[PDB]
Symmetry: C2
C-alpha cells in the first residue's frame, strides 16, 4: 500500500548538519518505506580508493532501490556527483522526484537540476532548515 521512498544527500551535507538527514528520513517514515545507502556511501567514500568493491555493491544496491522507489527524495544543497547520478538514473526510470534545496546556504542550484524540474513529476522545493517536516507533510498529503 505505502509507496517506496529513496533518499540520498551529499556526504558533505550530512556531516555539516547531522540532524537534518535524520529528520528528513524520520519524517519520510510517516509516509513510506525509506531506502537509502547514505551511511554506507559516507563510510566507503572516506576509505577512498581501497573500497572499490564496496563501491560496486553500493552502486548495484542503490540502483535496485531506485528501481523499487516510487518517489526519489534528494537533498541537493551541497554539490554531489552521486546524488546527481541517482537523479539522472531516476529521470530515465521515470520516477517521481522531490529535490530539497536550502537557498540560505548561499549556493545556487545547478541549472541542470532546475532545468529538469517541471513542477509536477520533478519538483524542487526550496526550504529553510526549520520547516522541512511541514514541507514533506505538504508534499505527501
Amino acid at each position: 500500500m505505502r509507496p517506496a521512498l529513496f533518499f540520498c544527500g551529499s556526504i558533505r551535507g550530512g556531516r555539516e548538519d547531522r540532524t537534518l538527514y535524520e529528520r528528513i528520513v524520520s519524517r519520510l517514515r510517516r509516509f513510506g518505506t525509506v531506502l537509502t545507502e547514505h551511511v554506507a556511501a559516507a563510510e566507503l567514500g572516506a576509505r577512498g580508493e581501497e573500497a572499490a568493491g564496496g563501491d560496486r555493491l553500493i552502486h548495484e544496491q542503490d540502483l535496485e532501490w531506485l528501481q523499487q522507489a516510487d518517489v526519489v527524495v534528494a537533498e541537493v544543497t551541497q554539490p554531489s556527483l552521486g546524488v546527481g547520478y541517482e537523479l539522472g538514473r531516476a529521470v530515465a526510470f521515470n520516477k517521481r522526484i522531490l529535490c530539497l534545496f536550502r537557498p540560505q546556504s548561499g549556493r545556487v542550484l545547478s541549472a541542470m537540476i532546475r532545468g529538469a524540474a517541471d513542477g509536477s513529476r520533478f519538483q524542487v522545493w526550496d526550504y529553510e532548515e526549520g520547516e522541512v517536516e511541514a514541507l514533506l507533510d505538504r508534499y505527501f498529503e
Copy 2:
C-alpha cells in the same frame, strides 16, 4: 569516421582547473569533435534553465563518448552521467586523487571497464592517458 565527444566537468577555481579543462578539451579535439565546446548565459535569458538542460541533453544524445572530469563534486555532471548511462553511451570519467577529494562511491561503483571506465590520473599525464583510451 570522427566521433562526437561530450566533455563536461565542474570548473570551480582559478587557472589550474581552467587550464586542465582546456588541456583535456584540446587533447579530445585530436580524436573527434567536442560538442560541448562549440558572466551569465544567453541560454537562460533565451529559455531559462529548461533550455540549458535541453541543450546539454541534445549534445549528450548526439555524443559517441561522454568524458567527465569528476574531481570536483557536481550535481550537473552527475546528472549527465546518469542520463548518459541510460542512453548506453561510452563513458570515461577522470579523477585526480591528489585533489584530496574522495570520489562518490556511486561513481566509482558504476565502472564496468567497458562502457563505463573511471581512470585516476595526475595532472601531468592526462594527455598520454587520453591517447591510451582513444588509440
